[PDB]
């Protein structure tokens, strides 16, 4: 459904993965930052488009960007 992309400016603060309401983001090993960790979006099929993740990023400009797109039952948050 929606598209979430992570950029090299990430600092591995883990704040984004701790804010997702649907477990779409994970922290994976990396060497480009001091923390030695980067964020990934393995399960974008469950993204609802809340953008809470973006609100949590501390980088000058979001290192995590959510681009809204095709809509499915899951993305539209339909319990019915």
């Amino acid at each position: 459904s929606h598209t979430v992309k992570i950029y090299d400016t990430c600092i591995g603060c883990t704040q984004c993965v701790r804010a997702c309401p649907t477990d779409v983001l994970e922290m994976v090993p990396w060497d480009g930052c001091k923390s030695g960790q980067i964020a990934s979006s393995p399960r974008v099929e469950d993204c609802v488009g809340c953008k809470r993740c973006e609100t949590a990023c501390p980088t000058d400009f979001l290192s995590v960007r959510v681009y809204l797109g095709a809509e499915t039952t899951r993305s539209l948050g339909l319990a019915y």
Partner: peptide, 10 residues
């Protein structure tokens, strides 16, 4: 296709 595969009235 994006709109076509949409399950709602949208």
């Amino acid at each position: 296709q994006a709109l076509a595969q949409d399950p709602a009235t949208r």
